[PDB]
Structures are given as structure tokens and as C-alpha cells.
Amino acid sequence: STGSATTTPIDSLDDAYITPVQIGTPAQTLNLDFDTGSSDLWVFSSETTASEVDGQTIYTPSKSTTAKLLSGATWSISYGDGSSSSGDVYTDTVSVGGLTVTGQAVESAKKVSSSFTEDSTIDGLLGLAFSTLNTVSPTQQKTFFDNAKASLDSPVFTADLGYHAPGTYNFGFIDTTAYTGSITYTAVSTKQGFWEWTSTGYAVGSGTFKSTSIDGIADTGTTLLYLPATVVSAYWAQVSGAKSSSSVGGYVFPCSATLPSFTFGVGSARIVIPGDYIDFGPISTGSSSCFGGIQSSAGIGINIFGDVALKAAFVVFNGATTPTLGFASK
């Protein structure tokens, strides 16, 4: 089997991407944030505290003929941005882009933090990291990908995120029309439950490539590119008037600037992030200070190849017995 679903930016900055997901019988379609940095499929629901729901579409298990309470199971998750959610668990039928899993754990939120409530466009998350990170207790649950894997034509999914445009998540096949050149594969460590890999270095604009190992995760659920402070300083030093602002919480730059590109290495291959991808617009409405898309990972404890980096590539998440990542230009 295979599946193919379009993923759509939630706003004009590509702050996140939403993908429609069918849950239950008859189908209830929710728009979920597919997150390769976590392993829980959780949704706004009929159980979510009413004051914490503000425009999201909810899953109502009582209206699904295939929903079953997973008796005694609870979940609770905290993300890198300080957000959180928790609740109880149902199993149900879940379909993505025509690919169906029966008996998927659907984590129903009883509580969500303010950042979730305030984002009316995201109805929940669909985790695509390794199932060792799943938070369900006392019986840990499998991701949608892990449950689908054995049925798929090939044990893979691909992320093809757009810049200010829709893109695609495919399951079970690699669309050879969706990228240019060849795919370069690179090793993955699953020791922290992430799609963790080592980039071979970077360049700023037209500058020379610096060969240096940068360990980090491929994380579709993180907006920005978070790298070591040395790398990030080298980037922003090429932008007149850019500075790190402790008041704003990262590097800002004059909105009048033209930003340089940023290249990262994948083995001997190179992915180029155009400068425009690094502009996250005014820090507050009407400001002439703009927020940068490349930020320091210092204090986060891991480097994160988030959407700024991934949207410049066609990315293969290869879930074979020994997982690997693939990157191609597009």
C-alpha cells in the first residue's frame, strides 16, 4: 500500500504545516501537524476542556463506530517550545492520503497549553519519530508509520515541504519526479528516538564550505533551523545590522536586508537554503526589525534541522531495519 497527502502552511510565514487526516467511522477529518520530532498522535476532542478549544475541529469518539477506549491508558507530552497536552486514549481507524491503519492509538486531549488553544489551524499532532518516544502509559503505543510499515510497498515516508506553498507527505514510495539529481543517504542514530544524523558542514552565501560535523535531528514539527552558536554567528555576521536580541529571543535583522543563502552538507552533497527562506518577517506588526530563521541551539541541547532547512529538500525518512535519511535538491 501507499498514501499521499498534501501539506499546507498554516500562515504566510510557514510557521507550521497541516495535513488532513481521517479518523473514525464515518470519517472525521482533522488537520494535524505531522511532526518527525515526536511520537504521539493526539487530537483536540470532545473531551478537551471547553475553555481550551478556540476554533479547532474536534474528534468525537462517541460518533465513531470503530472507536474503542484503550482502558487505563493516559498520555502527557511536553515539547521543546514549552507547550504541552495530555489526556486519555482511544484506538480507531486512521487514514492519511488513502493509507489506512486500523487500531491506531488516537490520544484524546483533555488539556492543552495556551499555544495550542491560540492556534485555531492545528487540530493536533501526528508524530513520526521513533515509537520509543511515545508517551502512552502504561502500554506504550506505536506511531502511524510504525503501524503502517509492514503493509507499505517500501518502509519509507517522504517530506516535501513548500516555501510559502503546499507540499506533500508520501508513505510507502519515493516519487522520482519530485526532486532533481540524486538522493544522498546518510546514517541515523535512533538512540534518542529522533531522526538524528550528522551534517558534514555549511557555507554562508557564496562563501567557502566549512567541513565540520553537526549532529542534529530532522524535525518537521520545528519551524526554524537551530545550529551551534559559532555557525549562527558566522551567518548573521554577513547581514548588516543583524544582532542577537535577548529581549526578542534570538537574532533579528533589518527588514530592509537581502539575506544570504545557507548551505548544509549531506555527505558530499549540498542543500542550499535560499536567503528568502530565512526571513520570518517583522518581530511585531509594523516593526522594521525582522526575525531570523536561523537561530542558536545553545541551551536546547540538540541541533534541529526544522522546516527552514527541510523545505529546501526532498527528504526520505527510511524506516528499514537500519533507518537512514535521504536528501535531494528539488
Contacts of 81 (CB under 8 A, 6+ apart): 115
Claim to verify: residue 111 and residue 62 sit in the same structural domain: yes
The residue range of the domain holding 286 is 175-330
Claim to verify: residue 87 and residue 227 sit in the same structural domain: no
Residue whose entry in the numeric block shows the C-alpha cell 541551551: 299
d(CA 72, CA 97): 31
CATH number for 283? 2.40.70.10
d(CA 295, CA 169): 26
Domain count, the chain: 2
Claim to verify: residue 20 and residue 167 sit in the same structural domain: yes
Is 40 an annotated catalytic residue?
Answer: no
Claim to verify: residue 68 and residue 212 sit in the same structural domain: no
Question: What was the experiment behind these coordinates?
Answer: X-ray
Spatial CA neighbour of 129 closest among 66, 184, 193: 193
For residues 155 and 316, the answer to whether their CB atoms sit within 8 Å is no
| 3-class DSSP state of 4 | strand
Claim to verify: residue 115 and residue 179 sit in the same structural domain: no
Cα 119 to the chain's mean position, in Å?
A: 16
C-alpha cell at 85: 497536552
d(CA 271, CA 308): 11
* Domain termination residue (choose one: 144, 174, 204): 174
Q: State residue 100 phi and psi, 5-degree precision.
A: -110, 135
* Domain termination residue (choose one: 174, 203, 237): 174
Q: Which residues pair with 236 in a beta bridge?
A: none
Residue whose entry in the numeric block shows the C-alpha cell 523545505: 311
Strands 68-78 and 84-96: antiparallel
How many angstroms separate the Cα of 123 from the Cα of each of 32, 77, 128, 216? 6, 16, 16, 28
| 3-class DSSP state of 134 | coil
| 3-class DSSP state of 265 | strand
Claim to verify: residue 87 and residue 210 sit in the same structural domain: no
C-alpha cell at 11: 500562515
Claim to verify: residue 169 and residue 192 sit in the same structural domain: no
Claim to verify: residue 183 and residue 311 sit in the same structural domain: yes
Spatial CA neighbour of 264 closest among 197, 165, 173, 319: 197
Pick the catalytic residue from 35, 40, 88, 219: 35
For residues 242 and 251, the answer to whether their CB atoms sit within 8 Å is yes
Claim to verify: residue 263 and residue 167 sit in the same structural domain: no
Pick the catalytic residue from 38, 85, 108, 199: 199
CB atoms within 10 A of CB 302: 15
Q: Which helix (H) or strand (E) holds 8?
A: strand 3-9
Spatial CA neighbour of 169 closest among 97, 273, 271: 97
Claim to verify: residue 153 and residue 299 sit in the same structural domain: no
Claim to verify: residue 240 and residue 305 sit in the same structural domain: yes
Is 35 an annotated catalytic residue?
Answer: yes
**Torsion of Cα atoms, 148 then 8 then 18 then 293, to 10°:** 110
**In 3-state terms, the chain is what percent helix, strand and coil (to 5)?**
10, 45, 45
* Domain termination residue (choose one: 145, 174, 203): 174
Q: Which helix (H) or strand (E) holds 308?
A: helix 307-310
Collect contacts of 278-282 with beta carbons under 8 A, ≥24 apart.
278/225, 278/308, 280/13, 280/223, 280/224, 281/12, 281/13, 281/255, 282/255
Radius of gyration of the chain (CA): 20
Contacts of 152 (CB under 8 A, 6+ apart): 1, 2, 99, 171, 172, 173
d(CA 216, CA 188): 10
Contacts of 155 (CB under 8 A, 6+ apart): 149, 172, 318, 319, 320
Claim to verify: residue 28 and residue 111 sit in the same structural domain: yes
Collect contacts of 151-156 with beta carbons under 8 A, ≥24 apart.
151/1, 151/99, 152/1, 152/2, 152/99, 153/1, 153/2, 155/318, 155/319, 155/320, 156/316, 156/317, 156/318, 156/319, 156/320
CB atoms within 10 A of CB 201: 15
Q: Which residues pair with 202 in a beta bridge?
A: 210, 264
